[PDB]
Paper text:
[name] DNA synthesis relies on three proteins: these are E9, the DNA polymerase bound to its heterodimeric cofactor D4/[name]. The function of [name] is to prevent accumulations of uracil bases in DNA molecules due to misincorporation of dUTP or spontaneous cytosine deamination by excision of the uracil moiety and initiation of the base-excision repair pathway.
Diffraction data were collected up to 1.85 Å for His-D4/A201–50-T2A and to 2.2 Å for the wild type complex. The structure of A201–50-WT is almost identical to the one of A201–50-T2A: the effect of the mutation is strictly local and affects only the mutated residue. A201–50 forms two α-helices that are packed against each other. The contact is strikingly flat with the exception of the prominent residue Trp43 of [name] sandwiched between Pro173 and Arg167 of D4.
Numbering used by the authors:
A (entry chain B): -2 to 218
B (entry chain D): 0 to 50
Amino acid sequence: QDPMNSVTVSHAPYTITYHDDWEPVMSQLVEFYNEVASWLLRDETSPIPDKFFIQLKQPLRNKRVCVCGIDPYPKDGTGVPFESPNFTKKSIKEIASSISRLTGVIDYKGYNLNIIDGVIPWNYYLSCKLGETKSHAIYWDKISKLLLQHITKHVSVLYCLGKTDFSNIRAKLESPVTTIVGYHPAARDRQFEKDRSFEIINVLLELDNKVPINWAQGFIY
Amino acid sequence: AMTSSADLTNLKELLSLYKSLRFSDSAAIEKYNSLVEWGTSTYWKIGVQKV
């Protein structure tokens, strides 16, 4: 409530609370959201409208990696990308077993990309109609570009999960940023299991004289 | 491919060569420049340049 600001929009959730690092985009976010939100709000969503924007509370200046999925869990999104508080969603379980395999940590009760220093977990579209991936693509589009471009000014590496969903990601950005497009954790044939993105991200970081990501900070005991 | 062991292997060799930067033949310097190009092209932007 000091590095946190808020702005008023014309549709639910009505207030957007954001960390200072997001300021330069807030003005256009408000205009973009007001023109589409009523269309959006016609359906029940994952996450609920009160949670659409809670990731804007995160600092950007301390981030070196954005881990990005296309949109929220079709059900039970919390507004924090990939978060599954009771460790029940498949993607987060799979990501966690990659990190287990990678780091040698074998007993754990949870994993959350949002508690890892230097990481910002991100959803490209900020909602979907309950049960239906990508159903709100057409509404989010201009916002999604606005927000991901802003993010990519701060991070050294953008990692996107979903070969098909992200095959055109470059077009969506202005200035180049180190970009990795890996398999979705649900991809056929355990391809996600063979995907070495988490380690590749860290070599890329060292090549940009940055500190590698300490993936084990993700675990919950 | 971006995501395989072999991408990881090439990125690690490029980092190693970047750390010494001390090339003693044409081979080596060429390996380094050609890894930079491959990395740049595969991941769009990387932190090191051709020398």
